[PDB]
Amino acid sequence: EKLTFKTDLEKLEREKAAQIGVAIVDPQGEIVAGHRMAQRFAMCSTFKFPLAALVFERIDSGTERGDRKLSYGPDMIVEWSPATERFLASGHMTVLEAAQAAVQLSDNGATNLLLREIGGPAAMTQYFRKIGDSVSRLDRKEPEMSDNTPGDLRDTTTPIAMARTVAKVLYGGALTSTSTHTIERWLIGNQTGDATLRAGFPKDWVVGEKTGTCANGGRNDIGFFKAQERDYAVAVYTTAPKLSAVERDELVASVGQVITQLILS
Amino acid sequence: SEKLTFKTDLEKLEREKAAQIGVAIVDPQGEIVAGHRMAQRFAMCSTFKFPLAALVFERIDSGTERGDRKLSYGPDMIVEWSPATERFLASGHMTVLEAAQAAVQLSDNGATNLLLREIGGPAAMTQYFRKIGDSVSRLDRKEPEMSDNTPGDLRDTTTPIAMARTVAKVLYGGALTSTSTHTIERWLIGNQTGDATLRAGFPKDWVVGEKTGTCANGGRNDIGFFKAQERDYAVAVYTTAPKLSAVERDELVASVGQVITQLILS
C-alpha cells in the first residue's frame, strides 16, 4: 500500500513538474504515510490555523477575551482582506471575528491584526515551540511571508512537523474541549478549500482544512479527516510553478485521491 | 426640496433602466425620512433571512432556544445555493447559530430552510412579523420557491416602508437584548454578498450593514442600516428590472445608494 502511495505521488511530480510533500499521522502523531515528509516548504496561509489555536489558548487562559475590539485604519488592508475591508468603516474587528476570517476566508488583514496584538511573528514561532514543534517558524507578516523564495528557510514548516502540530491542536490536548470543538467546526466550514483536498476525498469523510497559496507555484492544504470512524491529521505542501492556478487546485485534489487509496487499504 | 430631488433622481433611474424602485428610509423610531413606492408590494426573496435571524435571536434571548443546539440533517436539505450546508453535511449537523450566520452572511438557502423547519415553517415567520408590529410582511414558502416573484403574486411579499420599520424595530426598537442586537449588527456589516449593491453606493466612511436578495423576473433587493454624520437610519430597497443583466442590477442598487447619499448629505 505504501509503495503504491509513493509511486503514485512520484508520477504526479514527474508529469506536473511538481514537488509534493505529504504527511498523515494518527491522533498520537504516529506516522501513517508520508512523502518528502521532512523537506521544508513555505507555510503560506496554512499558519493561520495554528494562529487561531494560539488565540484560542490565550482566551482559554484568560489572557485574551474573544470579544475584545481591535481597532485599525486603512493601513491594515493588504491584498485579499475581504472581511477586514467590510469592517473598516466600523473601525474594528473583535479577536474572534478576526480569527474566524483568517481561518475561513484566509483574510490577510485579519491575520495581521492578530499578529500585531501578539507582538508579531516571533510570538507565533514561540507558540509552535510551546506545543512541541521545533521546526515551523514564522518570520514575516502577510503577504510577504508568502514570498516563497527558493531555498529560503523563513516562514517554513515540514509536512511531518505541521501534521503533528495539527494532531496536537485537535487531539493532543492543546486546547479546551470547547475550544477544540470550535476550531474543528471552523475548519469544516472553511470557505476556501472546496477544490483542493476535500475534492479528492470521499464525500462521507468528515474533513476540515486550511488552504494556502504562495508565489512561485505553492499550493498547500492542512487539516484533519475522519474516515471509517478513525481520525487522522494531514499536511500537504506542493510546489508547481509551471501549472495554472486551476491545475494546482487539481493537483492537491489528486493528492487527496492518492491519500484515499492508501487509507482505504 | 431634497425629497423632491430624491424622487426625481429615482424616477430617472426607473425610466432609463426599465425598472421600478421601492425605497423607504426611517429613523430609529420608524419615522419616515424619505421613500419611493413605499406602499408597493415587492417579493422579499432572501431579505427575509435577516428577520429570520432576529426571530431566532429572540428565542435565544427568551430561553426557548440554545445557540449551540445541533440541527441534524441529510442530503435532502441541500437546495440551490447552500454552500455552508453542503460543507457541514458529512458532519451531520449545523448549530442554530451556525445556520443563522450562514443564512445572513452567505444567503445559504439550505441553512435558511433548516431554521424554518425548527421554528414551524413560513407561518412562524409571519407570526414573528405580526408580533413586532409588522402587519404587512408575509412568508408563505420555503427556499428557493419563495423567490419565484410572479407579478402580482402576494405570497412572500413586503413593502419598503413595512420592512424598513421592521429593520428599525429589530436594531433600534428593543426587539432584541443589547447583546443580540450588537451581534446581528455585526453580522450585517460582515455580510459577504453585498459588496456590489447598496454599500457600493454609500461613502466609504459610512457604517453600513445589509442583507441582499435576488429573485426571478429581475428582482434585486438590499435592506439594512447605515450610520452617517453621527445619525442612524434603517433602509429597505426593493427593485424590479427584468430586462437588465445581473451585473446591471447590482449597479442599479448601487446607484440607488448614491441617490440616498445625495439625499442624506443635504
Ligand SMILES: *C(=O)[C@@H]([C@@H]1NC(C(=O)O)=C(S[C@@H]2CN[C@H](C(=O)N(C)C)C2)[C@@H]1C)[C@@H](C)O
Ligand atoms: C495564503 O496562502 C494566501 C491567501 N490564501 C489563499 C488560500 O488560502 O487559498 C489565497 S487565495 C484566496 C482564497 N480564495 C479566493 C479566490 O480565489 N477568489 C475569491 C477568487 C482568494 C490567498 C493568496 C496569502 C499568503 O495571501
Ligand SMILES: *C(=O)[C@@H]([C@@H]1NC(C(=O)O)=C(S[C@@H]2CN[C@H](C(=O)N(C)C)C2)[C@@H]1C)[C@@H](C)O
Ligand atoms: C435570495 O435572494 C436568494 C439567494 N440570495 C442571494 C443574494 O443574497 O443576493 C443569492 S445570490 C448568491 C449569493 N452570492 C453568490 C454570488 O453571486 N457569488 C458567489 C459571487 C450567489 C441567492 C440567489 C435565494 C432566494 O436563492
Ligand SMILES: [Mg+2]
Ligand atoms: Mg491607517
